[PDB]
Ligand binder design. Structure first.
Ligand code: CLA
Ligand code: CLA
Ligand code: CLA
Ligand code: CLA
Ligand code: CLA
Ligand code: CLA
Ligand code: CLA
Ligand code: CLA
Ligand SMILES: CCCCCCCCCCCCCCCC(=O)OC[C@H](COP(=O)(O)OC[C@@H](O)CO)OC(=O)CCCCCCCCCCCCCCC
Ligand SMILES: CC1=C(C/C=C(\C)CCC[C@H](C)CCC[C@H](C)CCCC(C)C)C(=O)c2ccccc2C1=O
Ligand SMILES: CC1=C(C/C=C(\C)CCC[C@H](C)CCC[C@H](C)CCCC(C)C)C(=O)c2ccccc2C1=O
Lengths: 62, 131, 72, 739, 37, 57, 80, 139
């Protein structure tokens, strides 16, 4: 279980920020798949900084 | 309206020349309009070959120049045969049903181009070497 | 030409040559069966590289032969 | 009506800190490294971020002051280096023998070998800019007059730079001060062009003509009185052309015939120098002034009399062309790009007209015998002119994307050209293919005929002749025109059409450039290569908004790389990419014009004259039978005349040899950007960010590959720089050695 | 203006102006340094 | 000749002027027509026509 | 025709639909939640393959993909 | 339906539109009501004038209809554009709005066509689907 503000590492192998550190901005309090919103320092090639991940793709390195 | 209307678009001075050439003329059969097309193009095509040739100051130059021009007409008979073999497959009908739209007469057109093309190449060989 | 210039210049150049062929009398009658398009993106990378590679090799083989056969 | 605003922009350094301050897209910080190139791309494009035409035009006005500053700064350096570091004083005593020189090189690592034996007791770089011949025609005899002019340009540079600060930060004019085109045309015609040619006509009479009358009498540059003495001492201006003793009474009483000795129509070349007669050019700009001052009283202002350009276009409409020119005035007083493209077209079209009128009618004394300068003066202004014509097709395309309004343009002359653009482009498409076959193929024919041992079947002068009869006739009506249809002129407009050989020193100043079978071929190469260059640029203009392929190409922009790999692939569809492709073709077109020029003159025109009168040219009349085949263009021009740019190592011409190979590098380096694409490098950089992220020091400004539009731009920039600077080095190292 | 001189193009230029002029003045008093003597 | 050319410019080019009645007025506010904008116009044109006429003959 | 497949990491942002120049895409309600949406491509025969729907998807490595298949007259974008 | 005949805008021009492809198979027509007599750019060349209308325009491509249908929603705010594709010498009537609403708006009753119940990193290798009729993205 990840909470907001927690510094996570992404295990989604397709992501631009795979195996990189980001801070969770929020989690969605419903049963929606991919609820974990992580904000990253580094922008991807579409110059965005957020994505929706699941709890299986993140860890709790804090 | 989809087509542009310039003042010289749809002018009767050039719409009358188009309607009377042997590609759009109404009275002709495909054997005749292949002959009229073939007689005109074979007549001038021997022009550049006898005056601009690899051999021009020879015995010698009027025949071999006109031998080259009938060489084009026998090449272009194949092109008119191959265009008819390809574009009219099964004699593919369309909305207009002319010689150009559906096939419907096409084997006669190529022979008409063959007869008039080889004619006027040889006909202009008479007016240059002789006459 | 196939390396520097790329495709959608030529696709918009053929869309006017298609027009000028469909509106020219005595040639409006002759019709293609294949709609003319530009060479594809992967296609003219190969076409540009082929002309590059043949021209690379043909030029040296003419120079390497004639610069040595003239003197030995 | 002058209307301004008082202090709209403060003079602060708060925005000097932040780069990218002007736009909402920038100044947030570079998250990637494209921002470093996004910043330098859209700075001087004021129209994108600022959405007020009043604010946009104030930026544009005060920026030309900054460009006026850098030209004056550059002009002062032209005058300073002629004052300090030049042999201009020794050159006036012997102008044929001594090579013109400035730019002494410092005694460091070995580049002081470039300070060569250039003439007299001076050592420096033999320059090819013609400033020595321009300053002699201006009358300058000592270096003090060059030194004060270098100071005079720097104070003028500060004057323009202050005026750009003042007219944006302090007193910025409103929009209505800029939209007054009739008062602007009135002022620039009579004031800038008329008084500028009236006041320069004053210099050529009082200053240039007296000192040159003694210089072509050949006394000394020291014995000649200073040019203020020709204003003060009226006895001194009376011993040479004694019509100054009557004053301005021939002028006001219309008895202008008394000025027949310093306002002539002699019209030839000086037999002592080989330049135009200065009394012709004195009479010239005086006649140009009155034509320009009178024409500046044409357009209407706040005094009622005068033409209105808005009502000349209304009721200039025919039956072919619909609503006529109605709307082109309102387009031209609102679009800054349509004003830019048209003023760029005829600035670059003029710059090639300047090149053609200056090798054949050499305006300056000892410019014609200076083959080292007359070729570089031609090849410069041709090259300057072709860049500006590509900027015409560029900025006409930027007009179409955001300044074109369909509501203002219904059935006018912009609408009706954008409605039959498929008829314009395809008829332009055919005439390139007709000209490419029937001009280049006549070289391919002549290659194949001379290779096969058939020299009687090619197109030559001892073969199937293609004589240029439409140009040889015009050579006849202009060579026999002095005395018959221009009866007051003593000699012809030029010696290039027909006339004697003017021989100044031992060398040809000018001689009749004949036209033959080869000249038919190259002038149709020129006709071909220009028509393709038009075809790419005009396709970009007419299809800048839409096509059958992409119907919303103006919603995507003037400068975007592609609409994807769909529709078969839509790479280089935008209006920017046609400017990118036309740059090579402009490079392709102009480089033949400069290859045509450099060998036409060396074989038929330029050369030496013996003591009897026979001419022996430079390359020895080998343009006639060599320049009809591509092999003769390779063997007798590019291989035979680059024998001075490669044998130049170890001599004073060595920096031409180093610029030769060094520009072959930058040209070939450009193909790395042109032939390849971006997405290779963006995954190659992903291996290099890893090897920096491994050692924990990867930059926070994330490295990106250059964009698709930038990779095209950085490849065309090094392409032109690589080939022009090769042609720069080949031309300079050749004609310095032989001419 | 001092915060302007800390920006990348100017401080990329004046240090390159410094490091070039370092190398320029070296070859004036110490010319033609092939090897260490 | 020159004084005739100002009348020839004032009779032909005079009614050619499209905008009439503008300023400035005459300095004594007189009831004189052809306002001194137009008088400087036809005299300059009269000096233009009268110059080529004199030099042409 | 080109194949367009929409993956379940979509968020109902509706950005790829309004960036389509040939009106291929549309929004549809989702089964398991019945509140959020997903894009859908019921008109893949109209797809030219411009990949503008991938330039507008905000998810990291976009939820809608375009695989350029066989080229018909629509997907070639031909006016003839 | 298409409501042909409907008045073409007052245009007279455009070489660049509706050539021989239209008469054999598949041309398109966009129909709208323009609430002025104002000028608008065409995808062919630029002007016509929109009628009071019932305005109709016969275009060559669907891509040219949505480009014009975007201009009427942008510049004139007339979003009532209703494109079609023709009969016997055409294919499919009533192309847009396909379900009575714009595609960016949600409408129940639509079915998720082309949906995948997986991510893109969960796509199989092509070696697993080698020598089969399955493709590496279809489900
Ligand atoms: C000297 C005092 C001074 C000061 C403090 C300012 C300050 C300002 N100016 Mg002003 N201005 C000035 C004089 C000054 N200006 C002058 C002399 C001109 C005439 C050129 C202008 C014309 C002008 C315009 C049109 C604009 C400004 C703007 C600005 C504001 C932002 C500019 C900026 O941050 O980039 C600083 C820029 C630089 C450091 C680059 C200067 C480039 C110089 C001029 C030429 C360099 C080319 C050179 C020849 C290099 C060639 C290549 C090389 C390799 C050889 C800032 C308040 C902008 C503004 O107010 O936006 C709202 C704006 O649009 N100024
Ligand atoms: C048009 C622009 C321009 C260019 C490209 C040059 C180029 C040159 N100048 Mg010149 N100069 C110019 C304008 C120019 N100048 C102006 C406007 C003045 C009057 C202010 C001068 C006054 C001047 C003097 C007194 C000297 C030069 C010198 C030089 C040469 C050495 C470069 C150098 O010393 O930089 C040094 C580097 C910096 C200043 C960077 C800080 C170089 C060829 C030198 C020379 O030719 O020696 C033989 C030299 O002594 N220049
Ligand atoms: C007779 C008086 C007069 C003179 C001598 C000039 C001269 C000039 N003006 Mg012009 N200008 C004038 C009146 C005049 N102007 C009036 C009355 C207007 C407004 C209607 C303008 C509006 C104007 C603009 C917008 C620009 C010029 C520019 C120029 C310069 C052209 C560049 C060049 O060739 O050097 C030149 C110095 C250009 C310039 O260099 O601006 C700095 C320029 O961009 N002028
Ligand atoms: C437009 C620039 C210009 C300027 C500033 C001058 C200025 C002068 N001229 Mg020159 N001149 C000019 C053009 C000019 N001229 C032209 C275009 C002609 C041919 C029509 C002449 C033909 C001329 C003659 C024949 C004479 C002058 C003379 C003079 C001087 C006294 C006249 C006076 O100011 O009252 C004065 C320095 C007089 C003088 O002092 O000469 C030494 C004199 O005799 N001028
Ligand atoms: C030297 C290399 C080269 C060549 C030969 C061409 C040729 C052409 N370019 Mg290309 N181009 C080039 C470099 C070249 N370009 C580069 C580097 C770029 C990137 C900037 C471009 C980008 C470009 C643009 C943007 C455009 C062109 C266009 C054209 C065509 C002009 C039409 C014409 O006159 O054809 C005449 C044909 C020739 C001169 C070829 C000579 C061959 C002889 C005469 C005939 C062949 C002999 C024989 C019959 C062969 C058949 C026998 C065999 C089958 C057995 C022509 C095909 C333009 C176009 O297509 O518009 C119509 C156009 O708009 N090119
Ligand atoms: C970029 C850094 C740099 C460095 C470390 C030096 C270092 C030096 N300079 Mg140099 N100088 C430089 C740039 C530099 N210079 C530039 C850019 C110019 C052109 C304006 C000069 C023009 C110059 C002159 C004219 C002289 C020096 C001299 C010197 C030496 C004496 C110390 C001094 O500062 O005076 C010292 C080795 C002097 C010297 O000792 O020469 C014998 C000397 O006379 N310098
Ligand atoms: C990249 C390959 C390379 C290498 C290994 C060298 C090495 C050398 N060059 Mg060469 N050279 C090169 C590229 C190279 N150069 C290029 C690209 C050019 C054209 C611009 C030249 C043109 C050139 C000339 C004209 C000369 C040299 C000289 C030298 C010698 C330096 C003498 C000296 O005082 O430095 C020693 C430097 C120091 C002790 C200071 C080190 C600290 C500095 C300031 C750090 C700067 C970092 C930025 C040295 C053997 C000179 C020579 O001695 O000929 C035999 C010489 O006259 N070079
Ligand atoms: C009505 C009487 C009249 C006569 C007999 C002439 C006669 C002449 N004019 Mg003139 N001219 C006139 C009025 C006249 N002009 C008027 C009203 C103007 C407008 C102001 C001009 C403006 C003018 C110009 C610009 C030129 C002539 C020239 C000429 C001469 C040659 C004409 C030619 O060859 O073409 C000839 C002597 C030409 C000439 O060579 O002058 C000597 C010449 O360049 N004229
Ligand atoms: C060429 C002579 C020419 O320009 O004729 C002039 C003619 C225009 O005549 P109008 O008197 O209708 O023109 C009024 C305006 O064009 C200018 O006043 O041009 C056209 O019809 C278009 C030419 C197409 C160019 C065809 C090639
Ligand atoms: C000229 C050009 C075209 C237009 C080329 C076309 C339409 C093909 C025209 C070639 C004609 C048919 C002549 C080709 C004949 C060859 C000599 C032989 C071909 C037959 C082989 C199978 C042997 C592109 O489509 C293109 C696309 C992408 C990048 C660059 C370019 C590009 O440069
Ligand atoms: C080489 C190449 C690249 C890679 C080139 C890049 C990334 C440019 C980077 C090179 C510059 C020189 C990096 C500059 C870094 C610093 C500014 C250096 C500062 C040093 C100071 C002392 C001045 C592309 O991105 C590309 C894209 C599209 C088509 C072709 C190409 C292409 O050919």
């Amino acid at each position: 279980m990840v909470q907001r503000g927690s510094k996570v590492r992404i295990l989604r192998k397709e992501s631009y920020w795979y195996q990189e550190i980001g801070t969770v901005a929020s989690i969605d309090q419903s049963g929606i798949k991919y609820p974990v919103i992580v904000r990253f320092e580094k922008v991807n090639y579409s110059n965005v900084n957020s994505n929706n991940f699941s709890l299986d793709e993140v860890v709790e390195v804090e | 309206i989809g087509h542009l209307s310039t003042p010289i678009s749809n002018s009767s001075a050039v719409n009358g020349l188009l309607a009377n050439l042997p590609a759009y003329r109404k009275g002709l059969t495909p054997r005749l309009r292949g002959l009229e097309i073939g007689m005109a193009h074979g007549y001038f095509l021997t022009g550049p070959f006898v005056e601009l040739g690899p051999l021009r100051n020879t015995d010698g130059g009027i025949l071999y120049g006109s031998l080259s021009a009938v060489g084009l007409v026998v090449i272009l008979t194949a092109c008119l045969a191959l265009y008819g073999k390809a574009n009219f497959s099964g004699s593919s009908k369309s909305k207009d049903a002319t010689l150009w739209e559906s096939g419907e007469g096409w084997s006669d057109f190529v022979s008409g181009w063959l007869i008039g093309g080889a004619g006027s190449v040889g006909f202009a060989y008479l007016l240059l070497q002789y006459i | 030409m196939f390396l520097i210039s790329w495709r959608g210049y030529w696709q918009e150049l053929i869309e006017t040559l298609v027009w000028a062929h469909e509106r020219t009398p005595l040639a409006n009658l002759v019709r293609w069966k294949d709609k003319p398009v530009a060479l594809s993106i992967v296609q003219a990378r190969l076409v540009g590289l082929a002309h590059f590679a043949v021209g690379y090799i043909v030029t040296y083989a003419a120079f390497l032969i004639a610069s040595t056969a003239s003197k030995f | 009506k002058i209307v301004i605003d008082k202090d709209p922009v403060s003079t602060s350094f708060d925005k000097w800190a932040v780069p990218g301050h002007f736009s909402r897209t920038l100044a947030k910080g570079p998250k990637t490294t494209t921002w470093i190139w996004n910043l330098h791309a859209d700075v001087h494009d004021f129209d994108s971020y600022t959405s007020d035409l009043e604010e946009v035009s104030r930026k544009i006005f005060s920026a030309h002051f900054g460009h006026l500053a850098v030209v004056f700064i550059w002009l002062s350096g032209a005058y300073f280096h002629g004052a300090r570091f030049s042999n201009y004083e020794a050159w006036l005593s012997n102008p044929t023998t001594i090579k013109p020189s400035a730019q002494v090189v410092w005694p460091i690592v070995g580049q002081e070998i470039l300070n060569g034996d250039v003439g007299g007791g001076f050592q420096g770089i033999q320059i090819t800019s013609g400033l020595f011949q321009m300053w002699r025609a201006s009358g300058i005899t000592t270096e003090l007059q060059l030194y004060v002019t270098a100071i005079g340009a720097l104070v003028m540079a500060a004057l323009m730079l202050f005026a750009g600060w003042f007219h944006y930060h302090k007193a910025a004019p409103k929009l209505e001060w800029f939209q007054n085109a009739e008062s602007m045309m009135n002022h620039h015609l009579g004031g800038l062009f008329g008084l500028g040619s009236l006041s320069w006509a004053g210099h050529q009479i009082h200053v240039s003509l007296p000192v040159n009358k003694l210089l072509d009498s050949g006394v000394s540059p020291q014995e000649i009185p200073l040019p203020h003495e020709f204003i003060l001492n009226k006895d001194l201006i009376a011993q040479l052309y004694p019509s100054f003793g009557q004053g301005l009474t021939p002028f006001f009483t219309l008895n202008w015939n008394e000025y027949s000795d310093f306002l002539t129509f002699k019209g030839g070349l000086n037999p002592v120098t080989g330049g135009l007669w200065l009394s012709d050019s004195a009479h010239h700009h005086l006649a140009i002034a009155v034509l320009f001052i009178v024409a500046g009283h044409m357009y209407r202002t706040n005094w009622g009399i005068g033409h209105s350009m808005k009502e000349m276009y209304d009721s200039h409409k025919g039956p072919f062309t619909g609503e006529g020119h109605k709307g082109v005035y309102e387009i031209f007083t609102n679009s800054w790009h349509a004003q830019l493209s048209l003023n760029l077209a005829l600035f670059g079209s003029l710059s090639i007209i300047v090149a053609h009128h200056m090798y054949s009618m050499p305006p300056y004394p000892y410019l014609a015998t200076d083959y080292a300068t007359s070729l570089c003066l031609f090849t410069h202004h041709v090259w300057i002119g072709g860049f500006l014509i590509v900027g015409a097709g560029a900025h006409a395309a930027i007009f179409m994307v955001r300044d074109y309004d369909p509501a203002q343009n219904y059935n006018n002359l912009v609408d009706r050209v954008l409605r039959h653009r498929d008829a314009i482009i395809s008829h332009l498409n055919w005439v390139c293919i007709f000209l490419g076959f029937h001009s280049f193929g006549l070289y391919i024919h002549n290659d194949t005929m001379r290779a096969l041992g058939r020299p009687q079947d090619m197109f030559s002068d001892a073969a199937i002749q293609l004589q240029p009869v439409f140009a040889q006739w015009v050579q006849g009506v202009n060579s026999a025109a002095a005395g018959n249809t221009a009866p007051n002129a003593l000699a012809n407009a030029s010696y290039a059409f027909g006339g004697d050989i003017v021989s100044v020193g031992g060398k040809v100043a000018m001689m009749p450039i004949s036209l033959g079978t080869a000249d038919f071929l190259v002038h149709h190469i020129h006709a071909f290569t220009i028509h393709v260059t038009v075809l790419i640029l005009l396709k970009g203009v007419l299809f800048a908004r839409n096509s059958r392929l992409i119907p919303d190409k103006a919603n995507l922009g003037f400068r975007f790389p592609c609409d994807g790999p769909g529709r078969g692939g839509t790479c280089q569809v935008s209006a920017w990419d046609h400017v990118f492709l036309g740059l090579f073709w402009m490079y392709n077109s102009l480089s033949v014009v400069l290859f045509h020029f450099s060998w036409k003159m060396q074989s038929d025109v330029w050369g030496n004259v013996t003591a009897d009168g026979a001419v022996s040219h430079i390359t020895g009349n080998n343009f006639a039978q060599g320049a009809i085949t591509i092999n003769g263009w390779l063997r007798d021009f590019l291989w035979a005349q680059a024998s001075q740019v490669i044998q130049s190592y170890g001599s004073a011409l060595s920096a031409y040899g180093l610029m030769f190979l060094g520009a072959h590098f930058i040209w070939a380096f450009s193909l790395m950007f042109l032939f390849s694409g971006r997405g290779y490098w963006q995954e190659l950089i992903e291996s290099i960010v890893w090897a920096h992220n491994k050692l924990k020091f990867a930059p926070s400004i994330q490295p990106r590959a250059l964009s698709i539009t930038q990779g095209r731009a950085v490849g065309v920039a090094h392409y032109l720089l690589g080939g022009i600077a090769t042609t720069w080095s080949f031309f300079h190292a050749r004609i310095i050695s032989v001419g | 203006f001092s915060k302007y001189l800390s920006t990348a193009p100017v401080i990329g230029t004046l240090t390159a102006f410094f490091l070039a002029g370092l190398l320029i003045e070296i070859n004036r008093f110490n010319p033609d340094l092939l090897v260490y003597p | 000749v020159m004084l005739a050319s100002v009348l020839f410019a004032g009779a032909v080019g005079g009614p050619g002027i499209k905008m009439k009645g503008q300023g400035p007025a005459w300095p004594f506010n007189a009831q004189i027509p052809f306002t001194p904008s137009e008088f400087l116009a036809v005299t300059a044109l009269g000096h233009i026509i009268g110059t080529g006429v004199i030099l042409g003959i | 025709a080109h194949t367009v497949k929409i993956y379940d990491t979509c968020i109902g942002c509706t950005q790829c639909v309004r960036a389509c120049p040939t009106d291929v895409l549309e929004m549809v309600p989702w089964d398991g939640c019945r509140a959020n949406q997903i894009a859908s491509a019921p008109r893949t025969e109209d797809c030219v393959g411009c990949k503008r729907c991938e330039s507008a998807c905000p998810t990291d490595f976009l939820s809608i993909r375009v695989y350029l298949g066989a080229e018909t007259t629509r997907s070639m974008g031909l006016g003839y | 339906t298409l409501n042909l005949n409907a008045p073409t805008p007052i245009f007279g021009g455009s070489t660049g539109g509706l050539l021989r492809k239209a008469e054999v198979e598949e041309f398109y027509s966009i129909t709208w009501t323009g609430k002025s007599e104002t000028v608008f750019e065409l995808p062919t060349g630029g002007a016509a004038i929109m009628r009071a209308g019932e305005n109709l325009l016969r275009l060559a491509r669907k891509e040219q209809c949505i480009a014009l249908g975007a201009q009427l929603k942008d510049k004139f705010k007339i979003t009532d554009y209703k494109i079609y594709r023709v009969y016997p010498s055409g294919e499919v009537q009533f192309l847009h709005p396909k379900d009575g609403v714009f595609p960016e708006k949600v409408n129940p009753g639509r079915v998720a066509v082309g949906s995948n119940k997986r991510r893109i990193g969960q796509n199989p290798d092509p070696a697993k689907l080698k020598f089969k009729g399955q493709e590496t993205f279809d489900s």
